[PDB]
Amino acid sequence: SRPLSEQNPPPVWFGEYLSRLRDTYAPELPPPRQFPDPLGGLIRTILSQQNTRRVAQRQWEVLTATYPQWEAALLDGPDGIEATLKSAGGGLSRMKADYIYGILAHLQEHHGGLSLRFLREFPHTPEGHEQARQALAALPGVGHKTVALVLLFDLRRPAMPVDGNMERAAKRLELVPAAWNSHKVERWYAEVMPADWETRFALHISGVRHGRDTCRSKHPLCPQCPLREFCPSASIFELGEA
Numbered sequence: 001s002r003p004l005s006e007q008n009p010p011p012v013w014f015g016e017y018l019s020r021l022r023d024t025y026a027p028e029l030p031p032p033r034q035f036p037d038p039l040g041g042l043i044r045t046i047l048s049q050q051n052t053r054r055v056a057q058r059q060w061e062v063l064t065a066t067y068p069q070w071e072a073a074l075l076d077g078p079d080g081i082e083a084t085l086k087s088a089g090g091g092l093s094r095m096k097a098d099y100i101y102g103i104l105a106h107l108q109e110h111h112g113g114l115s116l117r118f119l120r121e122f123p124h125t126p127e128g129h130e131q132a133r134q135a136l137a138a139l140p141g142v143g144h145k146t147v148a149l150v151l152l153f154d155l156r157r158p159a160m161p162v163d164g165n166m167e168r169a170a171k172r173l174e175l176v177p178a179a180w181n182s183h184k185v186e187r188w189y190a191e192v193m194p195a196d197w198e199t200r201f202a203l204h205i206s207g208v209r210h211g212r213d214t215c216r217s218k219h220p221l222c223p224q225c226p227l228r229e230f231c232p233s234a235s236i237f238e239l240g241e242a
């Protein structure tokens, strides 16, 4: 076997991909999440998945107003959490309630209480970051995309979350081959990207914005995309709408 970065080296213009995305879409980086406990960050990330930004934010507001401490959510059970989520709008309330409840119940029974503060105590070394990743991945229902998001957003650890928008753009740019699944795409990005948190955070913020707002699934805005000169797919889309 062979590292993904050797099977698939980044292009000569990779640095310009990073800098043009940052300059165009995130010239001033937003703050990462600094919640009292990473458990709150994890739950906030769960609310964001398969959801609009507006609904996820309303749900966070309503959920935390309803349950000022997570102990109250655990007592109210998945039915209570579901009702709370449903009241703020948005679907998948039953799925999300079960998922959140399962995390809380696991933490209470086996981790001494409703907290993920222990994630902050692992060393800030590649070995410690891997422990933090493994601990998030050991929570019931928590998949790799959410693990990467919590590491990057809540823990200041240099994971490399790649959302579906970013992946679509990466495949159109031919940064990664079409057949690679989302987890393999994340692994490739984590191998090739500069190791530092800030660069990785900047790519995630700017890449999500680019993929959502420019490299749209139907009708991408190639003429207005700063990556057009590097992109093998632009001509197909441009000539197509003509």
Ligand code: SF4
Residues within 6 Å of the ligand: 169, 172, 173, 214, 215, 216, 220, 221, 222, 223, 225, 226, 227, 228, 231, 232, 233, 234, 237
């Ligand atoms: S040129 Fe078009 S297809 Fe290529 S990255 Fe930009 S928006 Fe996406």
Ligand SMILES: [Co+2]
Residues within 6 Å of the ligand: 219, 241
């Ligand atoms: Co048009």
